[PDB]
Amino acid sequence: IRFCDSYNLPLVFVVDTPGAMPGVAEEKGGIIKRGGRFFNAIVEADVPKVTVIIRKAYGGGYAVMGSKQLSADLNFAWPTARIAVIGAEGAAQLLVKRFPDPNAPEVQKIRDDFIEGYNLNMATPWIAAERGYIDAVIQPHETRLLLRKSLRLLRDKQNGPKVQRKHGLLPL
Partner 1 sequence: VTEPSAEHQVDIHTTAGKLADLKRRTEETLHPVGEAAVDKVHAKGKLTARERILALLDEGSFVELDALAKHRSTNFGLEKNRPLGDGVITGYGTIDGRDVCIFSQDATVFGGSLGEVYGEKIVKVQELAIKTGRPLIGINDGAGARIQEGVVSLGLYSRIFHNNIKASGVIPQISLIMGAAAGGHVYSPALTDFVVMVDQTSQMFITGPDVIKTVTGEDVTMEELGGAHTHMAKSGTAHYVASGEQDAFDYVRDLLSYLPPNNYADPP
Partner 2 sequence: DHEAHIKVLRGEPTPEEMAALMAVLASAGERNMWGHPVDKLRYSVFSWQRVTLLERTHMRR
Tell me the closest approach of the beta carbon of residue 137 to partner 1, in angstroms: 6
CB of 96 within 8 A of CB of 111? yes
- Residue 24 binds which one of partner 2, partner 1, none, with CB within 5 to 8 A depending on kind? none
CA–CA distance, 74 with 143 (Å, rounded to integer): 12
- The contact mask relative to partner 2 for 21-60 (x = CB under 8 A, - = no) is -------------------------x--------------
Candidates 162, 154, 165, 130; CA nearest to 50 is: 154
- Residue 46 binds which one of partner 2, partner 1, none, with CB within 5 to 8 A depending on kind? partner 2
CA–CA distance, 1 with 39 (Å, rounded to integer): 11
Which residue of 164, 166, 167, 169 would you call a contact of partner 2, by CB under 8 A?
A: 164
CA distances from 169 to 25, 36, 60, 134 (A): 26, 11, 21, 29
CA–CA distance, 165 with 94 (Å, rounded to integer): 44
Binding site for partner 1 (CB under 8 A): 73, 79-80, 120, 126, 129-132, 135-137, 139-140, 146, 149-150, 152-154, 156-160
Nearer to partner 1, 103 or 121 (CB): 121
